């Protein structure tokens, strides 16, 4: 993947991993593997990936099953500014 990099660098910032972000691959795990990955946590990290890559994540395809691994939300957004 290309935009898993920017993607651990938005979750390293808000849910504030700073070196961890950098650590963990795409097949890694977020949903239960980072701490800090909680309620209104998930809103802010959503909300920064809109802001860098300037876009918009559709509604219907933001899940828990979204922020599973890296790779997850890597591949989502690679499909969004393709299609």
Known sequence: MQHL????????DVLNLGERKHTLTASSVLLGNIPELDSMA???????L????????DDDEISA???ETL??????V??????
Request: charged residues 20%.
């Open 5 to 12: 990099e920017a993607v651990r660098n938005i979750l390293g």
């Open 42 to 48: 998930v809103v802010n990290v959503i909300t920064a």
């Open 50 to 57: 809109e802001e860098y890559f300037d876009f918009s994540v």
């Open 65 to 67: 099953q979204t922020f």
């Open 71 to 76: 790779g997850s939300l890597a591949l989502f």
């Open 78 to 83: 690679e499909h969004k500014l393709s299609h």
